[PDB]
Amino acid sequence: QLNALLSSMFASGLVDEQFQQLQMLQEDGGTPGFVAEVVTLFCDDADRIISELAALLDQPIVDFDKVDAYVHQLKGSSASVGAQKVKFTCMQFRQLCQDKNRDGCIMALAVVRNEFYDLRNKFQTMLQLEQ
Numbered sequence: 669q670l671n672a673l674l675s676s677m678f679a680s681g682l683v684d685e686q687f688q689q690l691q692m693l694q695e696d697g698g699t700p701g702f703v704a705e706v707v708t709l710f711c712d713d714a715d716r717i718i719s720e721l722a723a724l725l726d727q728p729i730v731d732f733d734k735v736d737a738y739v740h741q742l743k744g745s746s747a748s749v750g751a752q753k754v755k756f757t758c759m760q761f762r763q764l765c766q767d768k769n770r771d772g773c774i775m776a777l778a779v780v781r782n783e784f785y786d787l788r789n790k791f792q793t794m795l796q797l798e799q
Contacts, residue, residue, distance in 0.1 A: 670798065677787075688750075704795055706749060707749055710749045714751075718780065721735060724738070730768070735773055742754070746758060753783045754784055757780040
């Protein structure tokens with residue numbers, strides 16, 4: 669059910685072993701709402717940072733230091749819930765921002781947007797099944 673959703677999430681690699689450690693917390697009585705709050709915070713942060721990145725990458729002159737700082741936040745957020753494919757994406761922005769390669773930042777943003785929407789959807793049914 670939820671067990672099979674969860675296995676699918678690891679087996680497809682949307683989440684790594686840190687996420688396992690997280691959910692071990694939810695499955696034990698004694699930390700109520702923790703998992704859900706951390707996950708939700710990832711869905712809200714990731715979502716707001718991706719929108720801000722999209723607006724920055726469409727300005728006439730791109731502030732590449734700011735894209736880089738926003739990505740760096742997205743990296744820490746994705747790392748908190750073990751969203752490894754997002755985190756790995758975030759890491760390819762460095763050379764892109766070094767080079768001031770708008771093309772490449774727009775492409776990596778779309779990759780990150782897709783991997784995010786996919787993990788988010790999983791997380792959302794995750795939480796709903798749990799309620």
